[PDB]
Amino acid sequence: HPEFLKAGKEPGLQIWRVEKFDLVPVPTNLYGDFFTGDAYVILKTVQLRNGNLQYDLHYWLGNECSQDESGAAAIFTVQLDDYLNGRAVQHREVQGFESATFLGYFKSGLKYKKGGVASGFKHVVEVVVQRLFQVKGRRVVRATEVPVSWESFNNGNCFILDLGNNIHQWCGSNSNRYERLKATQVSKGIRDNERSGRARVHVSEEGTEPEAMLQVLGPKPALPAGTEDAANRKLAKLYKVSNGATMSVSLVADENPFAQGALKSEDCFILDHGKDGKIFVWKGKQANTEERKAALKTASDFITKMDYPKQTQVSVLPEGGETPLFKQFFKNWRDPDGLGLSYLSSHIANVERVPFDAATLHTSTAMAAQHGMDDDGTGQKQIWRIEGSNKVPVDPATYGQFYGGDSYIILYNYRHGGRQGQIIYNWQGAQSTQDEVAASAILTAQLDEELGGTPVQSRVVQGKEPAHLMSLFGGKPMIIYKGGTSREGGQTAPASTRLFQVRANSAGATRAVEVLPKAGALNSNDAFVLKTPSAAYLWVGTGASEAEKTGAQELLRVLRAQPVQVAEGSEPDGFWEALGGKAAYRTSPRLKDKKMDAHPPRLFACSNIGRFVIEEVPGELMQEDLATDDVMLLDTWDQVFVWVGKDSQEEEKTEALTSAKRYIETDPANRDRRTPITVVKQGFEPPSFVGWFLGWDDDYWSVDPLDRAMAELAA
Amino acid sequence: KEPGLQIWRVEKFDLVPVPTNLYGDFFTGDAYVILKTVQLRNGNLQYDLHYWLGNECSQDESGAAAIFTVQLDDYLNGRAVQHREVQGFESATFLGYFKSGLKYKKGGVASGFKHVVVQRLFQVKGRRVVRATEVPVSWESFNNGNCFILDLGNNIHQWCGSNSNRYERLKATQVSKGIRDNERSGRARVHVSEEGTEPEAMLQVLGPKPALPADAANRKLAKLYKVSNGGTMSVSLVADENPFAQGALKSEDCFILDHGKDGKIFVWKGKQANTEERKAALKTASDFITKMDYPKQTQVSVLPEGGETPLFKQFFKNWRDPDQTDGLGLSYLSSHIANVERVPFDAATLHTSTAMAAQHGMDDDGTGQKQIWRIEGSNKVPVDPATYGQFYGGDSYIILYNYRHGGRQGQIIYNWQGAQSTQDEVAASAILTAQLDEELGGTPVQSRVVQGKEPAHLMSLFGGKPMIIYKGGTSREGQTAPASTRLFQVRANSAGATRAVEVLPKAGALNSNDAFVLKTPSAAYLWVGTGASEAEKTGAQELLRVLRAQPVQVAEGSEPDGFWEALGGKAAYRTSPRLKDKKMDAHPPRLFACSNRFVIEEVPGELMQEDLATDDVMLLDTWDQVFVWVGKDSQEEEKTEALTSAKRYIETDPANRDRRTPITVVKQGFEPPSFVGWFLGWDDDYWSVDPLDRAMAELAA
């Protein structure tokens, strides 16, 4: 096709409308307008850090779309992918049920217009206009063209009466303030993109309609009320498809942590997630082109076969160009092989990576975010141990040591930019008795309130310490003992033979974590420390580095022993006697600075009818999307931030921790239950949260966001 | 207990709450218990338990109140600092709770009067501590130096003597206004007047007006006794002379720090003293007051081991709490700085936060225009700009600095006095300093520095190059030869900048916190202690570039043995870590008025611009520096003794302060940022209206 040669040559967005089995370019100033009676093809091109080009191929089906118009669109998708050499990821998008990736392409929102080719309508920028859009949606904004009549309105939503030179935006009496804010975007969209600027926008609500409005629609009658999932979404299954060349499927894994090696390069599989709205088709590199080219028809037969809604999202992925959300259904997925990985998520492609440099940290929110460090860790701090129902100050000589039968609270003073903040780390030991971890959690909440509700609150449980917590002790390592307690009452005797993994972080800080002394608790990239009655070893891995060694060295200074250095694979035998054998340890290195590519951040909104629902926020992360009446989650991989809007309900405010946990337990990746949670208050966000938002503004909430909008680009 | 302040009146062996809007009214016939609760930055609660005794108080409710305070100190786990307060003689801490002064009312429980048709008369005395005493309704109560209030209920009549002072009339109006707002819930009019303008209402009740009427340098020496049997109490002197050894306080005993010549005695309870003896600390202290024939009003503080107040601790040489370099704060947090937000130093943002400037002694980044002269004979000689930042200890210099902070510029004259300069030359620099000041409008700040105790902001004036301070010799030209082996100490400030001070090359002159440099005939070391960061050793590097020698970097504890011999051995030095950030906690800033016999009076409570009296000379004692604020209408003698007044404040201090402490003279209307930044609520236009003219207008009526 002639358009295939214009396609995917630069990074960007291309949209073609399927027009009697031809691809016809949509005018760029009109991207995001779609005709309900038509089908389209969308190609998104991402630059790949290493200069290569990556392709997301969508087709979009309108509700009034003909069955030949949708078939043409699917044919073009298979054949465009083929022109780009199967390297692309494909998406089938149905109106109103589009995927998060697609929705992120459209910042001003989506508009669904009445008509299509069959009825003789076109995108063509002399405007005699009389449309009406019903605007709905909170994070994803959709304006649906509707009949121009009061019977189309309701007190819940915002409506737009487009009269050409004047655009009338009208807000329901029950329209929420933030919804009103999203609707102003579609209006300026009409003003700036369709009218090239020369048009004026008018805002009103019930009982304030201008005469222009009342002329077109008539006297206003009385209006009814608006009408707006669950958290099953953890389980998934996997099938092997057959006879792409009439379809039969074989179950290949029934629970969810999946064996990567069940993906045999000679076949095609279907990752089923239909109850959360998604199915994937995985194409083996050596599957026969008859089956590779029927992937989408395969997918729809499978959707019919299990009786899922026809709106279900479908993607097809080529072996080796898999997406993070596909890869996360599998145990320990790793690429067989540069900068960046398989897939670079579009919403984070624009982010410049910033390596760690401790001198300029106080200057970069991007460094603070990308490395999880609010400051060098050298500020003032206080450390307590819970004993019954009281905080008991820790012996300051032992700051940096933590016993796993205890629970601690650490109040820490951070400075970044020229700004002060506080963090309250609540560290919950693995054998801390349940009455004490609970008291430690309540004592943490009270301390936060006694200090004005502004300190960040971070729950950590032993073994999954956040990076910033390790950097609090000078250059000394955080030492984490398996059990026992430092309370004056019950000193214990430590174990016979003990083993300490000593890992380091982006900043050079170390933590020494006691693990069971078995050979299989070893990792290639860290230093370790064994202690027998006889001798005291300092083992060091091929991937270990010096600060792992400097760290493991002063651990032995505390354990009152003296080292015997040992390199990997070149071990004395009294050593691997001291573990009850030899087995195989973890050798595969760590993602380090590729963690952001493998697990990009994700922003969700979350709510509690007695059921927990989460709705993901598409696109680049923007402060604008932090609704002050909402509770949001920012899922880094290493940690989950919970951002509490000032005007959220107090039942949701005090559940913040539980919502994060319920989010983590229902994750289809089988997330570590110990993953740290960090609650953060609107107006007091720490650097390691704001760094992720290009365009954070510190006075943003000083003027109300809706009052700004209805003026700043209004008049 | 949350934070806040709670007052109960002791009524027939019972604790009865005082209505909170009447806090500050005390019946002269009653006794009261007062609990001040403060929050400690780490969230913890800190308790100050006072009981207060009116002059007309029975010995029985005065004993009831003492029972209630020891028993309430019980409920709070022996953690509170306790105080006995006697009418007219209350501690500074106590008086800082009552912003509008105290009121001493006639009556008590025995005569049947509570706090709950009015015709009383109050006499108002006092300038920093305003006390209003209820007096008989009659011209016989009046005099011409004080202010009086004739409370007629719906009308309140403030009357000012002709010889009363303008700032006293100011404090009287806070009393009047208080009565209006608190006792009459806003619904009353205050009527001010003087002699001859008495309204008819006043002359109707008082009749026709007849013709009317109109100690320091001791506080330095104290002693310390051991207490047994607090049965019949016996004591034993354990130290007789001011600076006390922390060790003398043993945990099994109780001690009485005796400052009776200055009106206070302390009781210190150890953790391991038996429990009867501790509950008797009030009674112990009283008998000690009897045995020594001290006035019955002598103030009494009882402290628990580990929660001692910073005044107490300053009677000891180098108090060091066993644990705290870590944690927020220390033993005690003085109530008046308990609201102060703590800025850490950040040079980009310094020009915005006067609070940062105060809290670290830095009026600006140290980079403005400067001129430096050296004193030869009786003249200033411009120093070689290429040698700026070097100072010889046989010279004295003057340094005129141009500072900008906020939107505004100001200037500081530093007068550096070398420790070996000749008396005539150092005295001449002081005369010349004050002359450079009079010539620049009288407005610059003048700061006197002695060699070896240089203030933080001065050692920030020289790019990133350190201040180098050689012990002897002279920049004038006759320069002589350096000593064969020389030891240098390199300290850093909170702004990163550093200062290199030559010391005697010995062992006790090492300091774990600092970089050092030692030039022997042979080699050249760069000993870097455990506590020294990277600005300390990048300081010590260009001192090696000026001495034109080359280094052999040595860390602490692990030193080649020719190092220790170019010293003459290895003796014991200081390992202590310095307070740095918690300095403000150990030594909170106090504000004083002085008059030169030399008398000083502390100003209680939160530091308030309002307390800076235009006809006064005031001392603001931060710890690293004494400010003397000079009121634009004080008398010329007071103005010209400002330096020597400060110098006398320092010699007479019980802390045995360092005689080399910097002194900084400051003029009303021209205060530097590192001074205004201690007064939250500072206003530049404050003096653009007479403070009494403002207050008698819109504040009152």
Swiss-Prot record, chain A:
Listed name of the protein: Gelsolin
Organism (species): Homo sapiens
Taxonomic path: Eukaryota, Metazoa, Chordata, Craniata, Vertebrata
Gene coding for it: GSN
Residues reported to bind Ca(2+) 8: 629-630, 652
Annotated Ca(2+) 5 binding sites: 405-406, 436, 485
Reported function: Calcium-regulated, actin-modulating protein that binds to the plus (or barbed) ends of actin monomers or filaments, preventing monomer exchange (end-blocking or capping). It can promote the assembly of monomers into filaments (nucleation) as well as sever filaments already formed. Plays a role in ciliogenesis.
Residues involved in Ca(2+) 1 binding: 37-38, 69, 117
Protein keywords: Acetylation, Actin capping, Actin-binding, Amyloid, Amyloidosis, Calcium, Cilium biogenesis/degradation, Corneal dystrophy, Cytoplasm, Cytoskeleton, Disease variant, Disulfide bond, Metal-binding, Phosphoprotein, Repeat, Secreted, Signal
Residue list for modification N6-acetyllysine: 518
